[PDB]
Amino acid sequence: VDTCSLASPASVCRTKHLHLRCSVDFTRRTLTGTAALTVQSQEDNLRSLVLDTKDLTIEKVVINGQEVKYALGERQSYKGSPMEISLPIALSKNQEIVIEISFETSPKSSALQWLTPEQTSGKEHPYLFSQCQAIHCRAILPCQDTPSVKLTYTAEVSVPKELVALMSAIRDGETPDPEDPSRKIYKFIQKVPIPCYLIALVVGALESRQIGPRTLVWSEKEQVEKSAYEFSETESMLKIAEDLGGPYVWGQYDLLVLPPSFPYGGMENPCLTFVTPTLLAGDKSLSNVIAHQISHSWTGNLVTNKTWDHFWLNEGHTVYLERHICGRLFGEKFRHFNALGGWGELQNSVKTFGETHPFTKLVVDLTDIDPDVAYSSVPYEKGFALLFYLEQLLGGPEIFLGFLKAYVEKFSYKSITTDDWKDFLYSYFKDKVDVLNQVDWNAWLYSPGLPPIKPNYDMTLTNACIALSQRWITAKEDDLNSFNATDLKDLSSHQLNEFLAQTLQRAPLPLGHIKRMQEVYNFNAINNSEIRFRWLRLCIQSKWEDAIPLALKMATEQGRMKFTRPLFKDLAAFDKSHDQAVRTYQEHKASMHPVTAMLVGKDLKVD
Ligand SMILES: [Yb+3]
Ligand SMILES: [Yb+3]
Ligand SMILES: [Zn+2]
């Protein structure tokens, strides 16, 4: 039972295939067309079924060439409205039928962002992009919006001829629209069964550049060159991921660099990973985000969480694989450095929510909780920490990677729970059950706060970061003159970011210290989004008024939630910038991503 879905569960019926025929109307801000669902009954004498929908307009439902009765239930907040369809003929178990639903989306669809030409790099054409994870596919089309159901799909998308449509599928040709010569139809095929949160669409003035044997990078023309360089390690990361997880089954691995309002660092849409342009640091330093999306091709897209309560299965294993990819490219001391950094991010999340907060539990009960509200670093970092702890307990990385590959093989094309994962772990490690029985399972999986055990981390690369952060924290006014640009000479960008994260954990620092840090290190000149984000938070929390315009600009010129949300929160918490923070949000709200707008609104207590 998926408590986030209002549709018939997988035990009643299952969608096997979706054939989508739609048209993108930029003037009306709507997607209109037909969703033809091939549904298999799992029960005898099946006479009706229920689908998830959210702000959809339904024109008609057609089965066997005739219109059928349907009814929309009362809206259940963020879950949308259930749509019950009356079947014309009762179905036997395993019988399949095709249900063709004619629909139209709302311009306020929570799955979509519509951009005017002014909001794009090129300034001549509009742009549209989707983001279905977790439960926004129901705001695009009627479906069993649950990851417990996997389906293949085909799609034909009509767009204005000057634009390009792309999807989470293999490109299957393009033709002029026969019904309209000012339009083009783009075709797509997804032959591997996927959960519907993996359905994705982009429409815009897109250009491509090849960067590997199975990879194109896509973006507006202005970002193509920078993107091709930034993500050049993609093929090398795919090869390592295949060695760790087994064959890459998806055919293509393309990357799409979205406009700055994209709310995540990356989204693992199959065949077409979506990424934020905030990765464009100019030195490939933020490539771990690509390693993470690549890893989801196994942990998440092949082996999927049965419900959102088990989201840590997708995230924890992906972060574990991501850190191994970067470890293979840059060494074991670097994997430990990132693992230790992740523990710090977990300390921060637990401090923010509070140690008894239910959102700090690894497995969360999402009945009546919007998954967008519950989203945090917890499933990523507490999930990673559990696997890293198990790796150490069980004999090391080579042994634990053997389990990860067997786990992917066992559960490929399926949707599983925490209990399915735990049972297989016990089965694989049957000769080490005495070791497994020492794990405090109740605490790790179901208790709030920090986990009961902290793993062992090599500190080689972290030492210089801690040492410099401690010099600044313990410094008095008479020590400020001892700091100089030479303090940073032997630090990588990763180490500079970690020095800032360590210092930010002890913020505020005195205003004189922050001013000195700018005087000697010129952090205001750094373009790297992660470093700039932590530096600005440190400035604002330390009450530097000069940083207010810089923090407001970063919070609005991009929309990656990881940055926008804490920047707005820090600005609202500083008396000097409070009013500016609220006004800026109110002015930008109408042109923000709908999910980001809702979350920033809640964080600021502005309705
Ligand atoms: Yb074809
Ligand atoms: Yb002193
Ligand atoms: Zn992820």
Ligand 2 centroid to Cα of residue 477, in Å, is 7
Distance CA 258, CA 202 (A): 9
Q: Which residue, 374, 309, 378, is CA-closest to 3?
A: 309
**E strand or H helix at 24:** strand 13-25
Look-up: residue for tokens 């800026």? 584
Bridge-based pairing of strands 164-167 and 112-115 is: unpaired
CATH code, residues 459-607: 1.25.40.320
Q: Where are the domains of the chain?
A: 12-204, 205-301, 302-458, 459-607
> What distance in angstroms lies between residue 231's CA and the mean position of ligand 3's atoms?
18
- Find the 290 Cα to ligand 1 centroid distance in Å: 28
Which CATH number does 302-458 carry? 1.10.390.10
Please give the distance, rounded to the nearest whole angstrom, from the Cα atom of residue 512 to the centre of ligand 2: 15
Q: What is the 3-state secondary structure (H, E, C) of 297-343?
A: CCECCCEEECCHHHHHHHHHHHHHHHHHHHHHHHCHHHHHHHHHHHH
What dihedral angle (degrees, nearest 10) is formed by the CA atoms of 304, 310, 313, 318?
80
In the reported structure, the alpha carbon of residue 191 is separated from the centroid of ligand 1 by a whole-number distance in angstroms of 12
According to the entry, how was the structure determined? X-ray
- Please give the single-letter amino acid code of residue 86: S
Cα of 19 vs centre of ligand 1, distance in Å, is 15
Residue whose token pair is 């339009």: 183
Resolution (A): 1.8
Ligand nearest the Cα of residue 296 is 3
> Residue 47: how many CB atoms within 10 A of its CB?
13
Q: How far apart are the first and last CA of the chain?
A: 33
Where do we find the tokens 């088990």?
A: 310
Ligand that lies nearest to the alpha carbon of residue 169, given by its number in the listed order = 1
**In contact, 33 and 141? CB cutoff 8 Å:** no
Closest CA to 39 of 1, 7, 80, 4: 7
Q: How far apart are CA 170 and CA 191, in angstroms?
A: 8
Tokens of 111: 């799955």
Q: Which ligand is nearest to the CA of 482?
A: 2
Place domain 12-204 in its CATH homologous superfamily: tricorn interacting facor f3 domain (2.60.40.1730)
Residue 551: HSE in the Cβ half-sphere, 13 Å Cα cutoff: 30
Task: Report the alpha-carbon distance of residue 39 to residue 7 in Å, rounded.
Answer: 13
Do 384 and 339 contact (CB within 8 A), yes or no?
yes
CA torsion, points 582, 584, 589, 595, in degrees to nearest 10? -70
Separation of 479 CA from ligand 2 center, angstroms?
A: 6
For residues 271 and 254, what is the distance between their CA atoms, to the nearest angstrom?
A: 6
Supply 432's token pair. Answer: 């080490």
3-state secondary structure at position 486: helix
CA separation for the pair 149, 415 (Å, rounded): 8
For 205-301, CATH number out of 3.40.50.150, 3.30.160.620, 2.30.30.30, 3.30.2010.30 equals 3.30.2010.30
Separation in Å, CA 561 to CA 327, 395, 417, 535, 588? 27, 38, 28, 17, 15
Cα separations in angstroms, 329 against 194, 288, 334, 480: 30, 11, 9, 38
**Cα Rg of the chain (Å, integer):** 25
Output the CA 266–ligand 3 centroid distance in Å: 7
Peptide bond into 134 cis (omega under 30): yes
Residues 289/279, Cβ–Cβ less than 8 Å: yes
Q: Which residues contact 484 (CB under 8 A, 6 or more apart)?
A: 520
Ligand 3 centre and the CA of 381: distance in Å?
Answer: 11
H or E element in which residue 63 lies: strand 57-63
Give residue 281 CA to ligand 3 midpoint distance, Å. 20
Residue 293 CA to ligand 3 centre (angstroms): 7
Which bound ligand lies closest to the C-alpha atom of 315? 3
Calculate how far, in angstroms, residue 404's C-alpha sits from the geometric centre of ligand 2: 53
Q: Distance, CA 171 to ligand 1 centroid (Å)?
A: 8
**Cis bond before residue 510 (omega within 30° of 0):** no
Q: Is 459-607 the same fold as 12-204?
A: no
Q: How far does residue 475's CA lie from ligand 2's centre (Å)?
A: 8
